[PDB]
Amino acid sequence: QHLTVATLEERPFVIVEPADPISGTCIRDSVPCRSQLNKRCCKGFCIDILKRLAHTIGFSYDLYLVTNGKHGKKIDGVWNGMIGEVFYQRADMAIGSLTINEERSEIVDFSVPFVETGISVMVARGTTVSGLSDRKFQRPQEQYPPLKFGTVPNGSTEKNIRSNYPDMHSYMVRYNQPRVEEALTQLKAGKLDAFIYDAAVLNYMARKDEGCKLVTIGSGKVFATTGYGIALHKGSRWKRPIDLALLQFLGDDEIEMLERLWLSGICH
Numbered sequence: 001q002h003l004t005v006a007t008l009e010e011r012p013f014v015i016v017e018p019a020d021p022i023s024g025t026c027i028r029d030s031v032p033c034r035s036q037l038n039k040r041c042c043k044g045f046c047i048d049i050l051k052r053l054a055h056t057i058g059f060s061y062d063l064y065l066v067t068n069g070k071h072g073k074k075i076d077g078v079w080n081g082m083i084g085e086v087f088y089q090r091a092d093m094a095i096g097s098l099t100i101n102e103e104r105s106e107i108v109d110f111s112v113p114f115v116e117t118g119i120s121v122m123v124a125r126g127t128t129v130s131g132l133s134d135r136k137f138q139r140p141q142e143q144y145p146p147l148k149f150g151t152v153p154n155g156s157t158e159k160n161i162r163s164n165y166p167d168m169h170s171y172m173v174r175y176n177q178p179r180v181e182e183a184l185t186q187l188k189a190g191k192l193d194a195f196i197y198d199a200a201v202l203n204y205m206a207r208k209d210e211g212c213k214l215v216t217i218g219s220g221k222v223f224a225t226t227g228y229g230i231a232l233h234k235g236s237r238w239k240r241p242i243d244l245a246l247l248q249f250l251g252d253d254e255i256e257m258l259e260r261l262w263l264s265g266i267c268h
């Protein structure tokens, strides 16, 4: 009846803000969230999902922001990030822009996916590349000044590229970005020619770009389609109620409403 939930900031799925200085509380559609290191309030698409699950299923929760890495990476036998919090049973569940992949699915249970995603590439509107099938990407060191392109490492995007396109991955390493905000800054400054990342996030960023100067190209057949899912302990008794609720939200057009509310933009 009381769940500990791990999350991670990734706008607009999870957005972190200070408490209202006037009231010292979380007002509007926000909820209290503390840091794993230990005030702060969280809102966004995934938080609205969490609020609805809590109400529909009938649990209370304690929400915290992960500081031990980000989404989840396995290094030398040990998981960090949201996946690690769930895998090591520090949290009952983790929710945010958490991408379902084979590696993670082996060790945690995932809810049914509630956001469709995958991998896409974002470029400046003028930049002449065809997409991720382009040799500028695929054979990066075959030309005069090489194309500069990178990702934010340590997550499902990098894992997918390393597994499927190890030569391209080795090239991208020097262009790793610390977060999406910095990657976008480098794209606009021409320090990167392309940014390869989660499709749901990139599409949102392109829809919100000032001047509509950034465009995304879907990866097509280069990478598979997947989804965000809620991570739970392997064998969790929470998987079924959560799945049924999510499936219900989908059919009630509640998820579509949340998409309109949180993910809509101006550019097309």
Ligand SMILES: CN[C@H](CC(=O)O)C(=O)O
Binding pocket: 071, 072, 097, 098, 099, 100, 152, 154, 155, 156, 157, 158, 197, 198, 201
């Ligand atoms: C939005 N997904 C994150 C970051 C990434 O895909 O690289 C992840 O699940 O790892």
